[PDB]
């Protein structure tokens, strides 16, 4: 349970760096922008996750549908097994029925 | 985001301080000590 004996270098975060100061700037782009672009368009990330959300099962299911054929073998296989496991679990196990 | 318990040291000390004056291994080992302290109270 031994705890480090030396004070860590104090990390100084400047809150006024570019990325922090400009944060959430275009979030209202639809309302103020005479709706053309929905705020979804501002989402950077995985192709299957842009402007969408779901529990792990739905997530995997969707990843497979979208990018499934671009996947590496091991990863596709793992994805399938994951799906089968989650399917079995959510549908057949739990307290609440 | 992995979270580990950093302060576990003090968690242990708040038990062990009550056990110092016991005889045997009860005064050292958190397991035995926790039990003995509870019985003490």
């Amino acid at each position: 349970f031994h705890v480090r004996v030396t004070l860590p270098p104090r990390k100084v975060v400047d809150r006024w760096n570019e990325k922090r100061a400009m944060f959430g700037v275009y979030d209202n782009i639809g309302i103020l922008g005479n709706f053309e672009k929905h705020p979804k368009e501002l989402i950077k990330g995985p192709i299957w996750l842009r402007g969408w959300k779901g529990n792990e099962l739905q997530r995997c299911i969707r990843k497979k549908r979208m990018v499934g054929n671009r996947m590496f073998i091991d990863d596709l296989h793992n994805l399938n097994k994951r799906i089968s496991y989650l399917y079995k679990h959510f549908n057949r196990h739990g307290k609440y029925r | 985001l992995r979270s580990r318990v950093t302060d576990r040291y003090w968690r242990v000390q708040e038990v062990l301080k009550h056990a110092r004056h016991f005889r045997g291994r009860k005064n050292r080992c958190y397991r035995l000590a926790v039990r003995a302290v509870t019985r003490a109270f």
Binding site: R4, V5, T6, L7, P8 | T6, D7
Partner: peptide
Amino acid sequence: AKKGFRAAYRFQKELERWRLLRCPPP
């Protein structure tokens, strides 16, 4: 290694206490 200031600081206090227990200041 565990990431945080808090426990380190809090321990620095203990170090000081022991230092004062082993050599008491005049």
